[PDB]
């Protein structure tokens, strides 16, 4: 409970209002946040019906040992031109300095803004104190459905409620404006698969080898590799994720790779970087791909497809057996301003 009062003196002035938030373990078990003291938190908000980006801020968080119990934080709220927007996502990014861990925790303002509603000369001495009492108010996250607590500390204040500026007509439906990100990436993924299915039609519904890997002679195995391509089309369409590989390729300033979990036998790991491999498409460059430990098991093994994305937004779908199909993510110039603003 110290991290609320620390942030009001260092993150506090650099914002407009703070959202004091305490996360219970039921929220921590869902988003899988391993509570070590090494964790660096980073916060930024994604605006709507405006050019969407706010600056990134580092917020301190401490475990509260016991009346709730859990991780304690403070979220920034930004008021451009004197008011809040209701449909305006505040993104919490959790990462460790050394290891491989990146988690995105997303909050909406209407779950926070509503939850806030009820002789030598003298030098001043103002230390950080937990003397101010807390008023615990309940909330639910819209995205996960796990409850989290909100503090309200005591200090033209009691006269007015918290200003909101609701959107104006014509407006898309707020089930579609809340999930602005998951309906943008899903249509890019569904247009990525349509390039792969068009590439089979120009070749005559075939799958050509690219990687020299010997195949044991059985007719059921030749039917099994075909089943890896159709299952990967059920996955790439159904996948709509914030941290996909092509998004890192669009906001890169190097090949970007993410393996897949076919038939739900694995969870997806997204955004793996190929450091030191230049995907030029020549037969010299595929050997540098094969030195990776992932690509050897996506091809010799089974149940895992693999997607390798160039910085020119051209991507191959690597199947087990060495088969590959060139595809292309189509991102317009208006779309790249939308992606590099909110994400990168």
């Amino acid at each position: 409970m110290d991290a609320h009062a620390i942030n009001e003196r260092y993150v506090g002035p650099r914002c407009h209002r703070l959202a004091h938030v305490v996360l219970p373990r039921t929220f921590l078990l869902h988003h899988a946040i391993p509570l070590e003291p090494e964790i660096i938190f980073s916060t930024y908000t994604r605006f709507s019906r405006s050019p969407g980006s706010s600056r990134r801020l580092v917020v301190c968080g401490k475990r509260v040992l016991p009346s709730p119990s859990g991780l304690a934080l403070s979220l920034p709220l930004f008021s451009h031109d004197g008011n809040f927007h209701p449909f305006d996502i505040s993104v919490l990014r959790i990462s460790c300095p050394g290891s491989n861990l990146s988690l995105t925790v997303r909050f909406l303002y209407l779950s926070l803004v509503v939850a806030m509603g009820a002789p030598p000369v003298r030098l001043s001495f103002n230390p950080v104190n937990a003397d101010v009492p807390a008023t615990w108010r309940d909330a639910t996250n819209v995205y996960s459905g796990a409850p989290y607590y909100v503090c309200v500390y005591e200090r033209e204040d009691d006269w007015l409620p918290i200003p909101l500026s609701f959107p104006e007509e014509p407006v898309p439906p707020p089930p579609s404006l809340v999930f602005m990100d998951d309906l943008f990436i899903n249509t890019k993924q569904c247009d990525f698969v349509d390039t792969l299915e068009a590439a089979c039609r120009t070749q005559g519904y075939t799958l050509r080898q690219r990687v020299p890997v010997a195949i044991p002679r059985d007719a059921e195995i030749a039917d099994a590799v075909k089943s890896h391509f159709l299952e990967a089309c059920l996955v790439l369409r159904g996948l709509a994720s914030e941290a996909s590989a092509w998004i890192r390729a669009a906001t890169s300033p190097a090949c970007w790779m993410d393996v897949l979990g076919l038939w739900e036998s694995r969870p997806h790991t997204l955004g793996l970087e190929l450091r030191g491999v230049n995907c030029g498409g020549t037969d010299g460059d595929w050997l540098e791909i094969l030195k990776q430990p992932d690509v050897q098991k996506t091809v010799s093994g089974s149940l895992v497809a693999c997607v390798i994305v160039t910085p020119a937004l051209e991507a191959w779908l690597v199947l087990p057996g060495g088969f590959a199909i060139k595809g292309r993510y189509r991102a317009s110039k208006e779309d790249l301003v939308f992606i590099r603003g909110r994400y990168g």
């Binding site: 519904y205 799958l207 010997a214 030749a222 590799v225 075909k226 159709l230 060495g322």
Partner: peptide, 29 residues
């Protein structure tokens, strides 16, 4: 015996089973 690697090895994909897979992906989204 294993097959030898060669860039002309093909796997012929059926037209109906690729489109019946397209029907499932519409509904699950």
């Amino acid at each position: 015996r294993f097959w030898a690697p060669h860039p002309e090895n093909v796997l012929f994909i059926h037209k109906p089973t690729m489109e019946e897979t397209r029907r499932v992906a519409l509904g699950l989204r």
